[PDB]
Amino acid sequence: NLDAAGFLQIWQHFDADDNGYIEGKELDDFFRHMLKKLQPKDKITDERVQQIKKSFMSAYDATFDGRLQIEELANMILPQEENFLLIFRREAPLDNSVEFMKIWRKYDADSSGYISAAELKNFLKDLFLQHKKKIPPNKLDEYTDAMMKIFDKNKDGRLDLNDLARILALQENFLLQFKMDASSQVERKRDFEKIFAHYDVSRTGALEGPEVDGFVKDMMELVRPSISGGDLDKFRECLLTHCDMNKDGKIQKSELALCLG
Amino acid sequence: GFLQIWQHFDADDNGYIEGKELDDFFRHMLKKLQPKDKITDERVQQIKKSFMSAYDATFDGRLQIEELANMILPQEENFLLIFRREAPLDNSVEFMKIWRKYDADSSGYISAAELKNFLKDLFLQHKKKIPPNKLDEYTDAMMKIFDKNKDGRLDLNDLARILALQENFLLQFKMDASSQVERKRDFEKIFAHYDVSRTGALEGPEVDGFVKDMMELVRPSISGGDLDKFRECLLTHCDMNKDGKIQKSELALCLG
């Protein structure tokens, strides 16, 4: 029924304040609208707004914050064929943070801690080449602008680390599966080995480059909310200062075991 | 108990009801709904399609704690009363008053015990009496649901999400508004917003609101510890008379 442009008009109407979320009254207004569409004969009541809201939010509030962001509305009302946003989801889920950091380090090429309009443009260009589509330069500028407006939450014209994470549907923190109860020397060894094996994607017995980055992001996010690009470089340097004893810029298994106890 | 049901079926404690845990979960459901009915593979598969279409919001064919919570807890009128006020929470100073009151040990984090105190007071504000076991249950449920990194603590952005804090106040101001008259109107609108006690200084949760909102212009949602760090940083560089308050003159000086 609905197409990309008309989906946008509905998104723009209900994200009244253009802050990237259908939240509070925007969301009640959205679900009031929905009741009239589905049941025109029926009178809108607070009980029925709350019933249709529960129903749809349980199916489509994938981030569990009680708000709708553009992808969650797209899942609700936009047929897959017209979902331009589905360009960023592959056949394989992105569940290794090292593979994410390789993309972050490629496109944040200067390691400024942010992806600029120009850097995002390079990312979209390569993404179109991966789908063997050729996009004319003016259309590429258009797409870049649209994407920046959609995903730039604090409106500084830049994507942070957690903005690219959201765009690429980065999965959960690998380290959250490990348990405090696993207290036995044998269990501690099995977990250390499983952990190092996961980040050591090149299987060289050291964490190098985006392998360090994945480990630092995941480790820091055990104790604090999603970290920034700048924070990643700060805590990375902090881990190297305290654990890279041979100063080779790599974290050898022995160095990490030492630093942890 | 919601937690006991979660713990039973997430047998291997990996954060997901998946594979056989999920078929076992939906076998258990059939017996609850229709005790007289015999479990068959067709009926497990039919109830699974049905419930996963309604509740698998992440579309991964697994249940995580929030998806199970949606399935059982919003059926409880008193649990839903936790998430209802008439007025939107769109002033971060009002949010910080709640943060500072209930972070009672000033750890920069809300513990299970502190969250229990918050829910108790919330029920008193709605003149509802909740049985003690239901209060414990709601506290444990909330901890497990909203503790995203599983350290047994709620951070600042977790409480923000629980209270539906709206955070667009500084994002309304525009780079275009370059005229000395416009800069004054915006500065005054900004100070007036955080200066909730109308004393011409930012005191206590007024400084907190301003620091959270200002820091979140350039970085993702900040932590409780981050708040105390940047708060002391703002005082070190702007509190010229060293009274622990940010007078309008001090902030105008620090900004330009």
């Binding site: - | 780079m175 200002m214 212009l217």
Partner: peptide, 17 residues
């Protein structure tokens, strides 16, 4: 040079200290 520019700059400076 709107007043939001000064806020952003102060935030960036404090976030780099």
């Amino acid at each position: 040079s709107g007043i939001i520019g000064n806020l952003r700059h102060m935030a960036l400076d404090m976030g780099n200290e």
